[PDB]
Design a protein around this ligand. Sequence first.
Ligand SMILES: Nc1ncnc2c1ncn2[C@@H]1O[C@H](COP(=O)(O)OP(=O)(O)OP(=O)(O)O)[C@@H](O)[C@H]1O
Lengths: 52, 109
Amino acid sequence: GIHDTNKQAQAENSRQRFLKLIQDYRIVDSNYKEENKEQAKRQYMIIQPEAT
Amino acid sequence: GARYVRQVRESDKSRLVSLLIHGPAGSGKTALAAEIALKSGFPFIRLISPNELSGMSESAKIAYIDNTFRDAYKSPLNILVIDSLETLVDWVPIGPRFSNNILQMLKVA
Ligand SMILES: Nc1ncnc2c1ncn2[C@@H]1O[C@H](COP(=O)(O)OP(=O)(O)OP(=O)(O)O)[C@@H](O)[C@H]1O
């Protein structure tokens, strides 16, 4: 699209949308990590089944 | 403390007295214990602390503490200081995990 302003516009729109997609992915990942932490806290912060 | 010391000194029937010193961390407990022990003025004084017991093995610790209790039954007036019980017995709450044999040995001693 370097020589046609319309093609450049199209490319930039694709870029924006793909960037939004990436952001969404990042968000999901972060949230899930944070949740996995709280569950891993839940399970072991208490007296445990009888010894090995 | 001094009162208790005189009590053990004089009485003929109370031949064994045990004390416990508890409080928040950093309250300065061992200093008090040592000061009482020193100012008592008995022939025989001894100290069991975690600080000595590093790096050695389980059988070795039980042996050592047994020896120390053996040695104190000469000399008809005696004093022993046991520092920081919980770390001698390997406490960590996560399991919780700790060594039961040592605990029993002290409980019987
Ligand atoms: N009145 C007092 N009571 C307690 N400690 C005192 C007092 N006056 C001074 N100290 C200071 O207490 C310090 C020793 O405290 P000590 O070793 O008993 O601490 P601790 O809280 O038992 O330790 P830890 O938490 O490591 O087991 C010394 O530096 C001593 O100067």
